Amino acid sequence: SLPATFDLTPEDAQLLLAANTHLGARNVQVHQEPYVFNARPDGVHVINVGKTWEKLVLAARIIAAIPNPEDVVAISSRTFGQRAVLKFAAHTGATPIAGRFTPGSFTNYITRSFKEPRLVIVTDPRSDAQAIKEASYVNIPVIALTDLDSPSEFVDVAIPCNNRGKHSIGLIWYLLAREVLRLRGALVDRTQPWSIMPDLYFYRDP
Amino acid sequence: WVPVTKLGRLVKAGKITTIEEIFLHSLPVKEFQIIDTLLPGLQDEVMNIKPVQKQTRAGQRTRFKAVVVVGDSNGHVGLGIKTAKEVAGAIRAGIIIAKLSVIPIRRGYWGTNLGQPHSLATKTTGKCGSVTVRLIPAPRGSGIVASPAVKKLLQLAGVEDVYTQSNGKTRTLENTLKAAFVAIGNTYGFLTPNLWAEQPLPVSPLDIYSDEASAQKKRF
Amino acid sequence: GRVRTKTVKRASKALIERYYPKLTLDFQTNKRLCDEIATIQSKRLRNKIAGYTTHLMKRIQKGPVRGISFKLQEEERERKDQYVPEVSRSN
Amino acid sequence: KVFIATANAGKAHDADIFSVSACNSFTVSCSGDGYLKVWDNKLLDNENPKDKSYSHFVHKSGLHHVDVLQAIERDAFELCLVATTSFSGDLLFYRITREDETKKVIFEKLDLLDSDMKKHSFWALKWGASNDRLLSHRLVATDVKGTTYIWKFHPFADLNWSPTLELQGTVESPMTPSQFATSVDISERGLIATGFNNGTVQISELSTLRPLYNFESQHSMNNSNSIRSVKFSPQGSLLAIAHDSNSFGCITLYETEFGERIGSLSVPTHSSQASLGEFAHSSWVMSLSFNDSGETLCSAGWDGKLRFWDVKTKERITTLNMHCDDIEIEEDILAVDEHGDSLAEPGVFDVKFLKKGWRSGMGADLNESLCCVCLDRSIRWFREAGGK
Amino acid sequence: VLVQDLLHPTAASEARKHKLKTLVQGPRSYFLDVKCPGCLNITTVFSHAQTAVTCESCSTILCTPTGGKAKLSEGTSFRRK
Amino acid sequence: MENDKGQLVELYVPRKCSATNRIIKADDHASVQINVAKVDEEGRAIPGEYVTYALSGYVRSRGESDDSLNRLAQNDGLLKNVWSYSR
RNA sequence: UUUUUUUUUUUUGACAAAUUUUUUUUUUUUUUUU
């Protein structure tokens, strides 16, 4: 097991709250996933956050286990998460796939978009289903920042988050980046919170 | 040659030795040269070619369609199908596809446990279209009891003694042979008693030396 | 009718991508610039290319066109949206 | 553009550090005192490399050249081979392996070659890392006579450990009388660049042991004609050489087929006294090194300044003075005092590129890494780019 | 789903389910002891009605029958015994 | 598999799914091999030292790899909570 | 301010019988003398 220092600290929790990551789904939590900390009156289901943190920690712990860091792929057709995935790509070794996916990015060369990833990470499995399905055919694990109502086909280590609002995705990706720096890298865990403000991530406006 | 894909490099640089290894970690073969390099003895067999006609405003696109079965007599075979506007090309690409999609065969004993396997391990069925193909373990000195195509496929497969039992419209070598391929394939995908012990799950050669044989650059 | 073809359009686009310095929004200057800048076979084709470049430049000035990017447009990356101090966390 | 510093280990050896090769896990460092010292590349950012240093006294005369080879062949056998030649001219091989739990580096010595061949006085050498072009790996070595020895190295031989060095060939001396072979290099394409002490560079193809062609000195007159460091671009045919004049440093570049020249690297203007001699460094160029990506070329001079040269541009990218503090601004020119040398007088020995992320930190995998060694014995490590 | 324990589930995910499709079948019908308005003494009554029950001694209405649970008329206290 | 004189054959013994214990045959390309890192003090990576988890293509297709993986991670020893044996 | 708005439709029957098509692996030079 991991040390006690790699747990959900108060400030991190506060940050998570500020975003509204814990906000789940209006219509349904699909029984695929049991990540609910009792529903709110006249609204959505609340997510067990600690669980989410633990999942993130795993995801990072899997990302670090991959030898070459640039064969991680950050999938994003979601306009909200494009800048996020770019920033994450810049920070980690990982390569980005912003905007349109273009089928056969994993299946079969000749195309220039042919990348052969060891691991794939996704923003949303609903909007980027083509990516996931492609990942099915060529032996790739998938790590999607899942919603509760959104589906769960072929997704491993699903991180239960809000993926509706701006302040959520950029946050999760940022956290992941921080973790993968804490693992395998320079930054100390407890003494250094890291002063790269999550305002760096998030969508454009305009 | 000049291989694309990560496997292509590994096979080229002499990292991956056997096809067994690839089979273990279940990595998808996209270049036909890989398997050729791995397994040299592999020989082809054009079972059947038939013409097929796309009817059109003017006349007919009479394109051919060849079924090629490749394999060596040591538990590896591959069925390949291809259509083309000429026969040669069709046969060629059929061989290609066949090499690409090779499968291993869990071949074992009838009952007695003596020097080297001879028949199939378990009773396997494969279906394709209307055709079903049940392959059954047979004792020593039984031989291949099947129709010509299937017989040939099994001769290539490296199976000595075997009973077969089919159903449906067998006059369509395509579907029959496909079913056979499926069935021989499903020999491994079937739980035996001797394979109940827990293995430690070895790490892939694609995982181990990724960095030392990744997609290179060197512009000059 | 008067629709510009593939080799005129694509090549024009390519030119704008790797020659944004120069290519001022006048036809005649571009016309000779094209003869200098790259080998073109016929006169007609060259002229067409020049015209399309002129058109493109004319419509680059008003806003950033989707498809083309010529390194001058790049800069907005780290300094993309640290934009608009609203002027007069909790609570 | 700019190269940020990761760390620097001061007072490494007793005598001068001559050569410094690198691999996936660690940088090997030879020296004049007689120790072989490996230094860990996997460092935790805020740490002195002395903490992960492992010494091994090999020969009292000292070690001027050393070369490393880290690779896998059968399943997952982490073959790390360190070969070295002492000041006595004695060839020694060492396989480097760590313990399972403790992680203590065990310097297991190897005597693969017989005593008849170890007798010969060697100098420079290099490992040609094969990729199934040869069945196993390749090795080259120079000597006092110029009879450049080449070995078809086999680590396995029916899989179980059984290392042998079968002799590929011996490319004899270029001219009679002979010349002292100063430097050597081998490429993946299969060419043997042999450097000599009179500005001569003998190029030999690997297959038939035949000389393809050779260059001569640019200087026709002595004012330091000798070759410093022959080097190849990894895949491509571009071939890099370094020679001097009367106390200067000059880089020269050629193509690997026709032998047509392409560019002498230089810097002009007034502080070099107008400058008839268009030279690269104000003092001798002690080391050259291509990066693993191909384009861009490093060059270390005795004057202190690491000049970086883009081979596409045929012009300097940037300088970096290793010994003395000279960052930020750069009014770039060769300092030529009327006596002879520049006013800058440090002692550089060697420089070397490392692949995109063999280090660990913020400057790791994002960027490539840079290694270098000095006369004061303060071995250094530098990150690159600074844009990630 | 896939892998779970059905021997010890939760009271949360069992009290919700039907009487017949629990692990051990059991009714959802406690017994109640009503204190009537007239008399001071109790009346032991089953929570579900079926018939319209009146009091033991001073015969007046206690609980009327409905589609399910008994309709206890007016202000009358009760227990779960 | 072992013939008369012991002596193992049956070229290549295949993997098993960590969840279902179903055989991961060659052509099953939907199947996955997760590789997880083992940490030390101050977390950190430790390169070349992993814990593997093989998952069948079928389960992924069905869309309940998540849960079983969570279980696998919990009972082995790299989490608390997350998965629940009593649903 | 779920929100605009639409109007219809003849007659044309037939065409003699027989009448295309099929194969598998791939490969080109010339020149004596001192």
Curated annotation (Swiss-Prot), chain B:
Q: Which residues form the signal peptide?
A: none
Q: Which Pfam families match?
A: Ribosomal_S5, Ribosomal_S5_C
Q: Does the keyword Ubl conjugation apply?
A: yes
| Superkingdom in the source lineage | Eukaryota
Q: Which GO terms describe its cellular component?
A: cytoplasm; cytosol; cytosolic small ribosomal subunit; nucleolus; nucleoplasm; small-subunit processome
* Domain S5 DRBM, first and last residues per copy: 42-105
GO BP term, pick one: rRNA processing
| Function in brief | Component of the ribosome, a large ribonucleoprotein complex responsible for the synthesis of proteins in the cell. The small ribosomal subunit (SSU) binds messenger RNAs (mRNAs) and translates the encoded message by selecting cognate aminoacyl-transfer RNA (tRNA) molecules. The large subunit (LSU) contains the ribosomal catalytic site termed the peptidyl transferase center (PTC), which catalyzes the formation of peptide bonds, thereby polymerizing the amino acids delivered by tRNAs into a polypeptide chain.
Similarity comment: family membership: Belongs to the universal ribosomal protein uS5 family.
Name of the featured protein: Small ribosomal subunit protein uS5
For this protein's source organism, the top of the classification is:
Eukaryota, Fungi, Dikarya, Ascomycota, Saccharomycotina
Curated annotation (Swiss-Prot), chain D:
State the source organism's domain of life. Answer: Eukaryota
Q: Which GO terms describe its cellular component?
A: cytoplasm; nuclear chromosome; nucleus; Ski complex
The reply to whether Cytoplasm figures as a keyword in the UniProt entry is yes
Q: Which UniProt keywords apply?
A: Antiviral defense, Chromosome, Cytoplasm, Meiosis, Nucleus, Repeat, WD repeat
Complex formation: Component of the SKI complex composed of at least SKI2, SKI3 and SKI8. The SKI complex interacts with SKI7, which makes the link between the SKI complex and the exosome in order to perform mRNA degradation.
Q: Which family does it belong to?
A: Belongs to the SKI8 family.
**The protein's name:** Antiviral protein SKI8
Species the sequence originates in: Saccharomyces cerevisiae (strain ATCC 204508 / S288c) (Baker's yeast)
Gene field: SKI8
Swiss-Prot record, chain E:
UniProt keyword Ribosomal protein, yes or no: yes
| Alphabetically ordered keywords of this record | Cytoplasm, Metal-binding, Methylation, Ribonucleoprotein, Ribosomal protein, Zinc, Zinc-finger
Q: Where in the cell is it found?
A: Cytoplasm
Q: Which residues form the signal peptide?
A: none
Q: Which SUPFAM superfamilies match?
A: Zn-binding ribosomal proteins
Segments passing through the bilayer: none
Give me the comment on cofactor binding.
Binds 1 zinc ion per subunit.
Task: Give the ZnF (C4-type) ranges.
Answer: 36-58
GO biological process terms on file: maturation of SSU-rRNA from tricistronic rRNA transcript (SSU-rRNA, 5.8S rRNA, LSU-rRNA); ribosomal small subunit assembly; translation
- According to the UniProt entry, which residues carry S-methylcysteine? 39
Q: Which InterPro entries does this UniProt record tie to the protein?
A: Ribosomal_eS27, Ribosomal_eS27_Zn-bd_dom_sf, Ribosomal_zn-bd
The cofactor named in the record is:
Zn(2+)
Alphabetically, the GO molecular function entries are: RNA binding; structural constituent of ribosome; zinc ion binding
Q: How is it modified after translation?
A: The N-terminus is not modified.
Q: Which GO terms describe its cellular component?
A: cytoplasm; cytosol; cytosolic small ribosomal subunit
Q: Which HAMAP family match?
A: Ribosomal_eS27 (MF_00371)
Partners and quaternary state?
Answer: Component of the small ribosomal subunit (SSU). Mature yeast ribosomes consist of a small (40S) and a large (60S) subunit. The 40S small subunit contains 1 molecule of ribosomal RNA (18S rRNA) and 33 different proteins (encoded by 57 genes). The large 60S subunit contains 3 rRNA molecules (25S, 5.8S and 5S rRNA) and 46 different proteins (encoded by 81 genes).
User: What does the further note read?
Assistant: Present with 43300 molecules/cell in log phase SD medium. There are 2 genes for eS27 in yeast.
- Mind telling me which PANTHER family this protein's record contains? 40S RIBOSOMAL PROTEIN S27
Which family is annotated?
Belongs to the eukaryotic ribosomal protein eS27 family.
Q: What is this protein called?
A: Small ribosomal subunit protein eS27A
Organism name: Saccharomyces cerevisiae (strain ATCC 204508 / S288c)
Curated annotation (Swiss-Prot), chain F:
Further details from the record: Present with 27400 molecules/cell in log phase SD medium. There are 2 genes for eS21 in yeast.
Q: Give the family, as the similarity comment puts it.
A: Belongs to the eukaryotic ribosomal protein eS21 family.
N-acetylmethionine found at: 1
Q: What happens when the gene is disrupted?
A: Reduction in growth rate, a decrease in free 40S subunits, an increase in the amount of free 60S subunits and a decrease in polysome size.
According to its UniProt record, where is this protein mainly located?
A: cytoplasm
InterPro entries, from UniProt?
Ribosomal_eS21, Ribosomal_eS21_CS, Ribosomal_eS21_sf
Q: What does this protein do?
A: Component of the ribosome, a large ribonucleoprotein complex responsible for the synthesis of proteins in the cell. The small ribosomal subunit (SSU) binds messenger RNAs (mRNAs) and translates the encoded message by selecting cognate aminoacyl-transfer RNA (tRNA) molecules. The large subunit (LSU) contains the ribosomal catalytic site termed the peptidyl transferase center (PTC), which catalyzes the formation of peptide bonds, thereby polymerizing the amino acids delivered by tRNAs into a polypeptide chain.
| Alphabetical GO biological process terms | endonucleolytic cleavage in ITS1 to separate SSU-rRNA from 5.8S rRNA and LSU-rRNA from tricistronic rRNA transcript (SSU-rRNA, 5.8S rRNA, LSU-rRNA); endonucleolytic cleavage to generate mature 3'-end of SSU-rRNA from (SSU-rRNA, 5.8S rRNA, LSU-rRNA); translation
Reply yes or no: does the keyword Ribosomal protein apply. yes
Q: Name one Pfam family in it.
A: Ribosomal_S21e
Protein name stated in the entry? Small ribosomal subunit protein eS21A
Query: What is one cellular component GO term in this UniProt entry?
Result: cytosolic small ribosomal subunit
What GO molecular function terms would the record report? Answer: structural constituent of ribosome
Query: What is the residue range of the signal peptide feature?
Result: none
